[PDB]
């Protein structure tokens, strides 16, 4: 529980909903890479790490074992389902706000469980598509997840933004406002 | 509200004092409950919860399965740590300092740095101010950079020079940024 | 250089 560095050499996720799965490696709380289980390729999140190799079949076979163990635990627990947690959403800028300078809006969606969420950006009455990216579901000690969405923007005095979050723990979609101030 | 059954597997390595201390804890989680784990310090599977008892019974009875798990500390943790020594542990991103008036409040923004270790001090006329400073927690941006904001409760006068003092392992010498009215 | 990963094992049915 106490160390200089903690690494997850295999964050394996499988859930009955989709059914969907996720495979990632984490080091000191950051996503090293994920495996696109559909495309069967390793996608590295840090440029320096592209020099390495990881066989996606390790992820594909890992998820297949989880699918097996999940059906076992569903049966053993008399179909005990997951509890919907109320996610926590906070929006902030990557760097200080200057009306001229480019920036990045960060939408942190914390305490996600189950790992099924919709994160969309709204500006002045329409959804924003250009320049938004997402991290994978990042693991937490309490076995919930958090997820971060980015929106590259050019701050303007009249342009305000909203982070729209859809989760089963929410009775209505949660909007977190961000104003250039 | 759809029903969902979730399964997680985390192969976690804990590093301390370089390679002096290495520990592997593989956690099998159903929903948000760790049910059975293999901790290399004990050297065999241990049920964490009532549901993980049949799994630990079965795995501990297979010497072959027990062989690979005991070697996973060397095969996985130690092997990858040598890769981390040349990559993530070499990553050094210089923090970007910026002072922005909020006058009676002063905010020193330390943005986009890695690794996480940071030290921020305020300075008013070569005299360090500690009675009027308030700092946000360490913020993880999710893109392998961190940021931290240190606010300053101040009372300006004609001739005051406010200086923010930042120390970071990427720096050979601390960074200093000044502000005058 | 190749990255190594821990492997879970099946159980039950």
């Amino acid at each position, epitope marked *: 529980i106490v160390a200089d560095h903690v690494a997850s050499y295999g964050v394996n996720l499988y859930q009955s909903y989709g059914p969907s799965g996720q495979y990632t490696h984490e080091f000191d709380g950051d996503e090293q890479f994920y495996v696109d289980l559909g495309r*069967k390729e390793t996608v590295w999140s840090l440029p320096v790490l592209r020099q390495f190799r990881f*066989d996606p*079949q*390790f992820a*594909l*076979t890992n998820i*297949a*074992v989880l*699918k*097996h163990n999940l059906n076992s635990l569903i049966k053993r627990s008399n179909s005990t389902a997951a509890t919907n947690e109320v996610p926590e959403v906070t929006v902030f800028s990557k760097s200080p706000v200057t009306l001229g300078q480019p920036n990045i809006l960060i939408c942190l969606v914390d305490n996600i469980f189950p790992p099924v969420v919709n994160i969309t950006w709204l500006s002045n009455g329409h959804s924003v598509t250009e320049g938004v990216s997402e991290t994978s579901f990042l693991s937490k000690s309490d076995h919930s997840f958090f997820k971060i969405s980015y929106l590259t923007l050019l701050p303007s005095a009249e342009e305000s933004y909203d982070c729209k979050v859809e989760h089963w723990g929410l009775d209505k979609p949660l909007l977190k406002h961000w104003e250039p101030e | 509200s759809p029903e969902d059954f979730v399964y997680q597997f985390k192969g976690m390595c804990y590093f301390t004092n370089g390679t002096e201390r290495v520990r592997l804890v593989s956690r099998s989680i159903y929903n948000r409950e760790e049910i059975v784990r293999f901790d290399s310090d004990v050297g065999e599977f241990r049920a964490v919860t009532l549901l993980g008892l049949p799994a630990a019974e079965y795995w501990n009875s*297979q010497k*072959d*399965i027990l*062989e*690979r798990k005991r*070697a996973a500390v*060397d*095969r996985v943790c130690r092997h990858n740590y040598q890769l981390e020594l040349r990559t993530t542990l070499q990553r050094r991103v210089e923090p970007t300092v910026t002072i922005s008036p909020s006058h009676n409040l002063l905010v020193c923004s330390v943005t986009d740095f890695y690794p996480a270790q940071i030290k921020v001090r305020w300075f008013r006329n070569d005299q360090e101010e500690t009675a009027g400073v308030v700092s946000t927690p360490l913020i993880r941006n999710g893109d392998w950079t961190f940021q931290i904001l240190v606010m300053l409760e101040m009372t300006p006068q004609r001739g005051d020079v406010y200086t923010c003092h930042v120390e970071h392992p990427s720096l050979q010498s601390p960074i200093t940024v000044e502000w005058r009215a | 250089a190749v990255v190594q990963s821990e*492997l879970p*094992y*099946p159980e039950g049915s």
Partner: T-cell receptor
Amino acid sequence: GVSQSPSNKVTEKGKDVELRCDPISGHTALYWYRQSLGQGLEFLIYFQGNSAPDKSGLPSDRFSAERTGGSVSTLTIQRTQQEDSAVYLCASSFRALAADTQYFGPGTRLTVLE
Amino acid sequence: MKTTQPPSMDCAEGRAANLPCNHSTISGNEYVYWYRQIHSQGPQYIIHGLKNNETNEMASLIITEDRKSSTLILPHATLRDTAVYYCIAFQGAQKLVFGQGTRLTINP
């Protein structure tokens, strides 16, 4: 032990043949090989659970394998050729890609004739 | 890492049969596996090991301290031990590969 059927199969070319394999109970990884003599072990395909992540290794598109139940697997050779004649071996282990001990079956000696 | 074995060997029945295997380039994650195949059936798993010495009800396996060579020991050879014996360096991979093995003959 791993079971395989049939033990022998003599067929005319162009016919479809179906091989059966019964893995050890509790083994979620299942492997297909074929062996000529003199020749070595030729890998064909493997299954983790009911899915085969490695479809390559099959000699041609006339070869197809299934393990729908997650237990018993079947290998089908449509429109057999002369070169298909071999001893088709089946194996199973706890898990794939884990260096688990692979246990073999008696095999199916297939002979295809013009 | 590949393995090399003597192509053919002889042993008298009732005596311990020692089969050698060389694997100098073996890595830390590669196990030393032994199979035998009687003419001409399915391969039979004999024994395997990493660093220690293992003992089956079928045979024993002695691995040198540097892991660069190994020995399979059939305790009390009979006619049923006449087969081809394969020594393999095995790590995480789908394919298990057989070399030429040792054509072991047990003479009466």
